[PDB]
Design a protein around this ligand. Structure first.
Ligand code: FAD
Ligand code: SF4
Length: 581
């Protein structure tokens, strides 16, 4: 075999055009519901939950199906988790007696600027966006688990292990619903004796809650020109691990943040370190890097691992034990990047569209609120008559009206010029100055709205123009390698199936990427999926994709300079097995 025809997924090579599928029967069974939700995350659950609450209250019949990639609810949830109860309490005011895991109220807020050798404390005032009074630090994965339970209790039909891989359209052109991934296909594309076609879930309205950079929404944006009046979404990559530390250095309810070292003024990013108070002396810590970074030699992961060695942070994990690892991409575009949320037959909610309060690093509370509103507005239209036709799929335009008048809108508006102010000659340090001027003093009142530099993908410089970064070697106690890390994420997929990291053209990673940027996919991926392998013999290399290690963070679909990669879902159930991350 060859070069090696790295891509074989049906989305790029339709099996309706390859002979090997000549006699297979593609007939799918189908299920009818009123509302189908895609993604069992905080938003998707909020929507599902609220819809069944409304149904019960006015006692009417509502079938609500919720699909999820994860083997089980919460398995794919990754966050640091500092929660603003606002939307959650709205949905579950009775939460304290029903068991929800909000057990760590924030007690101390800290923030510092790091240099190679020192930590410079920054005062945090009562107006600023890094305040956390009345907020809780949680284990998002557990909370989501808890929510799924309530949902199930309310009568929501949850289907974990089922990934939506196809968008179903009606003949008029509106969304009819989705189809779950098929199963039983070999790495090469050929159907296995165990081939089975996925499920078809038809609804009047489909909710898309795929989170940050969902793959369905990605094609949804094109189909209905949803990004027509906004700037492209900009992202960051968040790396995280869980630690068990010395009870002596545990300070429950403390929330830490930092900026600076090991990053250079022009690379947006920082850490977060949260002391849980759920029983064990447990720490939730991480690092974020803005995927708008310029140097091809930069590695988010090596930066993270390198960060824990700062003399202000190392002592705290000194003699501790790391028990988990994971990564997820997050939104940073904020206000300027919110697209049109509705189209005939479906809605967008949560971080798929993007309601992230970047400076606060909070996107859970808004995510939930959007789910609440979505649910209310959809109930409002199935409970009425007044037909909007020639779109067999409803267009719940009222969802967007209501979202714009909620606190969500004004919250994101108020912090819209913070991230953008980081593109000055002072990089993020200038952004800090902006926060003290225009926000602490004017609470974001300024009569203008700054713009983003554009897509994160064209922000990379050619390798020959940059200097490579010399990262330390992991000591195996504070900093670890990539493979032990992937191991601690619990991620796994059936090996015999086409790689879900699809390529539009199998030649650009070697001709363009390795050539010009020196293969950045080998470093921006936090799970070592892409590697450039020497060729059997002659010269050059070949790209080897170890799809089995993918932790579904979506960073590659975002950062690839050649926008040649398109993340798609692998058989349902595959992926990380996160527990309380
Ligand atoms: C490092 C880091 C730190 C953070 N810290 C905070 C913090 O302190 N406070 C805060 O409020 N927020 C924080 N966030 C943000 C928070 O995690 C998100 O805004 C929030 O989870 C977004 O939620 P969502 O409901 O849209 O779904 P997500 O949690 O993004 O979940 C989407 C779900 O959909 C499933 N899914 C995706 N595509 C499909 C498909 N095709 N078919 C089926 N299922 C699918 C996924 O498996 C996933 O379970 C942080 C994020 C990161 C990465
Ligand atoms: S291959 Fe998977 S894990 Fe690696 S960056 Fe791309 S999405 Fe993230």
């Amino acid at each position: 075999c060859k070069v090696p025809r790295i891509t074989t997924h049906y989305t790029i090579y339709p099996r309706d055009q390859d002979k090997r599928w000549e006699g297979v029967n593609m007939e799918r069974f189908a299920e009818e519901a009123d509302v189908v939700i895609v993604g069992a995350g905080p938003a998707g659950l909020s929507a599902a939950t609220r819809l069944k609450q409304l149904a019960a209250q006015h006692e009417k019949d509502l079938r609500v199906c919720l699909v999820e990639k994860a083997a089980h609810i919460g398995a794919h949830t990754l966050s640091g988790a500092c929660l603003d109860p606002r939307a959650f309490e709205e949905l579950f005011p009775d939460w304290k007696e029903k068991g929800a895991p909000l057990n760590t109220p924030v007690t101390e807020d800290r923030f510092g600027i790091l240099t190679e050798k020192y930590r410079i404390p920054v005062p945090i005032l009562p107006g600023l966006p890094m305040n956390n009074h009345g907020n809780y630090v949680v284990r998002l994965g557990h909370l989501v688990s808890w929510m799924g339970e309530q949902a199930e209790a309310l009568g929501v039909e949850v289907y974990p292990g089922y990934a939506a891989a196809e968008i179903l359209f009606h003949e008029d052109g509106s969304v009819k619903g989705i189809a779950t991934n098929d199963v039983g296909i070999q790495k090469d594309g050929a159907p296995k004796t165990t081939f089975e076609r996925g499920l078809e879930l038809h609804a009047k309205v489909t909710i898309f809650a795929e989170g940050c950079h969902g793959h369905l929404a990605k094609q949804l944006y094109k189909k209905f020109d949803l990004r027509a009046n906004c700037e492209p979404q900009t992202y960051g990559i968040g790396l995280k691990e869980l630690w068990v530390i010395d009870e002596k250095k545990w300070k429950p309810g403390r929330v830490d943040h930092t900026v600076g070292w090991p990053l250079d003024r022009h690379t947006y990013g920082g850490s977060f370190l949260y002391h849980l108070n759920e029983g064990e002396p447990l720490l939730a810590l991480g690092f974020v890097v803005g995927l708008d970074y310029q140097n091809p030699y930069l590695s988010p992961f090596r930066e993270f691992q390198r960060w824990k060695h700062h003399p202000s942070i190392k002592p705290t994990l000194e003699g501790g034990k790391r028990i988990a690892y994971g990564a997820r991409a997050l939104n940073e575009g904020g206000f300027q990047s919110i697209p049109k949320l509705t189209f005939p037959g479906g809605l967008l909610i949560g971080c798929s569209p993007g309601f992230m309060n970047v400076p606060k690093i909070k996107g859970t509370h808004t995510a939930m609120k959007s789910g609440t509103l979505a649910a209310e507005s959809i109930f409002n239209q199935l409970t009425s008559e007044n037909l909007q036709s020639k779109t067999i799929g409803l267009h719940v335009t009222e969802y967007e009206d209501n979202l714009k008048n909620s606190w969500v809108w004004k919250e994101l508006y108020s912090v819209r010029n913070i991230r953008p102010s980081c593109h000055g000659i002072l990089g993020v340090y200038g952004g800090m100055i902006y926060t003290g001027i225009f926000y602490w003093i004017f609470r974001g009142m300024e009569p203008w709205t700054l713009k983003h530099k554009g897509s994160d993908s064209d922000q990379l410089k050619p390798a020959k123009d940059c200097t490579p970064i010399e990262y330390p070697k992991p000591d195996g106690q504070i900093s670890f390698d990539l493979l032990s890390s992937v191991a601690l994420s619990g991620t796994n997929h059936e090996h015999d199936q086409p790689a879900h990291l699809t390529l539009k053209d199998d030649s650009v990673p070697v001709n363009r990427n390795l050539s010009i940027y020196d293969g950045p996919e080998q470093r921006f991926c936090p799970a070592g999926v892409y590697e450039f392998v020497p060729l059997e013999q002659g010269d050059g290399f070949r790209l080897q994709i170890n799809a089995q290690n993918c932790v579904h963070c979506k960073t590659c679909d975002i950062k690839d300079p050649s926008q040649n990669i398109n993340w798609v879902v692998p058989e349902g159930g595959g992926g990380p097995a996160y527990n309380g991350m």
